[PDB]
Ligand binder design. Structure first.
Ligand SMILES: CO[C@@H]1[C@H](O)[C@@H](COP(=O)(O)O[P@](=O)([SeH])OP(=O)(O)O)O[C@H]1n1c[n+](C)c2c(=O)[nH]c(N)nc21
Length: 181
């Protein structure tokens, strides 16, 4: 009976990355691979072992990306892409940051965007004194149907009311909203 002893494989293998701001080093040198996983059980083992985003020192990031995609604009799968951005105020560090981030992780590993989950590259949480950010990165900023489907599903999974609007920005511009939902 395979069900009783095999781990549950995920559709993709994922890599978790950590960034710590250190002014001595370049941005790329501050980015480090923590580990990879490709089962539900190994996901939770990693998540349960690491700090909540709300407990990270200001200036740190977590990134969860499909194995083979580095969490940087320069990666072949990100250079023509962009991000759905969730901007948090300082009070939301306490109320929403960790629950939004875990919901974002599950959207990725559970492949929650139907046919368009293949357009997903990964997600990033930035812990910053001026206000935290969470973002889902996708591979092609010109694929309007894929980008807007991901954005609408993401907004509903986060539980954001219609009085909130979230925006999608291309990395080429970051390096202006193209879409809003
Ligand atoms: C070279 O500087 C860039 C960014 O200007 C710098 C800060 O990115 P970042 O840490 O995303 O900005 P925040 O601290 Se949330 O603050 P604002 O976005 O300015 O409100 O971090 C570097 N950086 C940030 N990212 C995401 C990248 C990247 O993908 N590739 C490269 N080459 N650099 C990146």
């Amino acid at each position: 009976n395979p069900e009783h002893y095999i781990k549950h494989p995920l559709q993709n293998r994922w890599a978790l990355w950590f960034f710590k701001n250190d002014k001595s080093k370049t941005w790329q040198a501050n980015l480090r691979l923590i580990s990879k996983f490709d089962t539900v059980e190994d996901f939770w083992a990693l998540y349960n072992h690491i700090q909540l985003s709300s407990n990270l020192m200001p200036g740190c990031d977590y990134s969860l990306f499909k194995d083979g995609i580095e969490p940087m604009w320069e990666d072949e799968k990100n250079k023509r892409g962009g991000r759905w951005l969730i901007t948090l105020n300082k009070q939301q560090r306490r109320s929403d940051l960790d629950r939004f981030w875990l919901e974002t992780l599950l959207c990725l590993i559970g492949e929650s965007f139907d046919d368009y989950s293949d357009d997903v590259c990964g997600a990033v949480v930035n812990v910053r004194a001026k206000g935290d950010k969470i973002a889902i990165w996708t591979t092609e900023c010109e694929n309007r149907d894929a980008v807007t489907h991901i954005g609408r599903v993401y907004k509903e999974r986060l539980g954001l009311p219609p009085k909130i609007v979230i925006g999608y920005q291309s990395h080429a511009d970051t390096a202006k909203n193209r879409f809003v939902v």
